[PDB]
Design a protein around this ligand. Sequence first.
Ligand SMILES: [Zn+2]
Ligand SMILES: [Zn+2]
Ligand SMILES: [Zn+2]
Ligand SMILES: [Zn+2]
Ligand SMILES: [Zn+2]
Ligand SMILES: [Zn+2]
Ligand SMILES: [Zn+2]
Ligand SMILES: [Zn+2]
Lengths: 6, 264, 284, 123
Amino acid sequence: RIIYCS
Amino acid sequence: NIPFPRTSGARFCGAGYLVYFTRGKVIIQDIACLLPVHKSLGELYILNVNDIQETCQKNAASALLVGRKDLVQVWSLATVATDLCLGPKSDPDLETPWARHPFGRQLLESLLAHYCRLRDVQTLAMLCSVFEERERDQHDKNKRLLDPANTQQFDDFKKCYGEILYRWGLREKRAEVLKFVSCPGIEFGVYCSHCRSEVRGTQCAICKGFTFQCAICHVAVRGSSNFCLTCGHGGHTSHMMEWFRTQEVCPTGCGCHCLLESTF
Amino acid sequence: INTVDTSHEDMIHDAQMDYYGTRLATCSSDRSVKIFDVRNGGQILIADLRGHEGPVWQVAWAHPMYGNILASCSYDRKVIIWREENGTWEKSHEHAGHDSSVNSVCWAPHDYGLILACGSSDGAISLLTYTGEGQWEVKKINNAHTIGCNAVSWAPAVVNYIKRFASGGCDNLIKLWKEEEDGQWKEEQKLEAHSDWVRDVAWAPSIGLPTSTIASCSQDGRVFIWTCDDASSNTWSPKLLHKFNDVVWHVSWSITANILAVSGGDNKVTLWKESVDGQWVCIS
Amino acid sequence: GSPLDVLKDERVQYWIENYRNLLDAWRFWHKRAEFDIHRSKLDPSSKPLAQVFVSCNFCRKPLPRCALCLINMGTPVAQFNNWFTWCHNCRHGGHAGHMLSWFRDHAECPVSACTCKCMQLDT
Ligand SMILES: [Zn+2]
Ligand SMILES: [Zn+2]
Ligand SMILES: [Zn+2]
Ligand SMILES: [Zn+2]
Ligand SMILES: [Zn+2]
Ligand SMILES: [Zn+2]
Ligand SMILES: [Zn+2]
Ligand SMILES: [Zn+2]
């Protein structure tokens, strides 16, 4: 989730 | 053999300045928007070994006050990658360590290689610090997120960032950073109060007693201490905080104005 | 942007700031070495140093570690040290062992100690080593450069130590010198890829990356950013940045060795930065 | 009164000693210092001896340097911010002001690879 949605 | 005199020059001075002159007056530039290190972040960053979780969140918050999108995401990932629920175990045949997981050593070694090209010492030094029978030996090497064959580079990162922090003017932060490095004349002796001999340490050797006795509360001192070089009457630091605040004479009836004969 | 208006009539030749960014030391051609205090945008004249036979080329500050020290090199046998004691600036030491004029001074890295290197126009280097109690152990080597030795640089300290420095002179050659275990300063690989007349040499600060870079300048106008990617190899592959239309005087790295500022005869200052493809492009 | 006739008796000394002790119980410590100054100005005989030596175990150089400041000890440069504090079990120290700045927030000897909490070791 941290990787794919800022 | 003598070259022709020159009439212009430019040098980088300090940590964020530029001096130059031309064919005269000298101007001084403040060009700090062209370097990969930021001075405000060095004043807002914290390190605290006893609670890693808090440091990551505080630094992530501080990264938003400067507006760097990169650092917020990096410090977010650091929090979840350094949780206390992913502790290595002792037996190899019980679990696979988090270090071998592709979100462990390989992601760290891909952030470190990215920031190396940008010459960002300030992030490398922080990251390398936060993350800090044959089969059994191999396991211990295998379960570490930083390769045990690259300690020298990490030490170099920390040392250079410490020198920069000294250059800026911050003294405490340099010590905080340097506390994480893996690789670690004339003195003062105490005249003991019982055998009247010089004692190397807070405890004597012949009578094994305390060698130093405070000159205000007459209680033996075992930690910090200040003393006068001429007359030699010392005690706790806060005691002389209080005493030499106003008076200028020895607290033990000595006549030695220690404030003037000690502060060289 | 801050400005200071110096008094001395003769044109300025060098200018440097201290470690913390508080004071300023300007060399000149008349005689003066006047030092200012630029804290919070000021000009207040702390001192006005005097006493020199000829004009002075360079001024170099030492680390705050060993007090306030400043070195000067002039058109004479003169490397006077200008220590300040008890809140006043004064002459501290002089050394006049070189016949021709000495045109370069460089302090050694603070890890070694307090060492100064000066290269005279005669073709010799003098190393001033501090032994304590206000004494020096000055040693020198001669016949190093035919008609040169007009620029010296120290190398960053790496891991007892192996002292190194980089020089260059009239012979259009740059030699690297390594101190042997005995104490004698031997010689090593000497690069020769320039044409007319080298003027200055600078060596990059280290961060931990296992690459060493050196910049060089000459009357050609060609600036070469040498590089070496292996400590054992001892090989340097020259590269060109730009062929200037005039003589190129001074090159200076940045704190993190990512920007290089070049000044020369064309009466201008240029900034350069390496691109991702490996080409060096200007910024301003 | 008489310095060298009564003050040498082993009955006037016990009274002064007991008074000093009673003062030290109540925690009036500055008053004791004032009393001792008065006593010394009256008679010289009861004068304390020195306490701290300056020997060089490793018998044109310096030796101790500040920790936070790291500048060499001794040499010049709110007047108590120039003594050199020393730890006993740790043998470290620096300027008074620098170490007091350090110890307010953190609790450990600034020299890395040390585990001596010098300030709270004595309370
Ligand atoms: Zn004893
Ligand atoms: Zn006490
Ligand atoms: Zn005293
Ligand atoms: Zn005394
Ligand atoms: Zn000694
Ligand atoms: Zn200090
Ligand atoms: Zn201690
Ligand atoms: Zn310690």
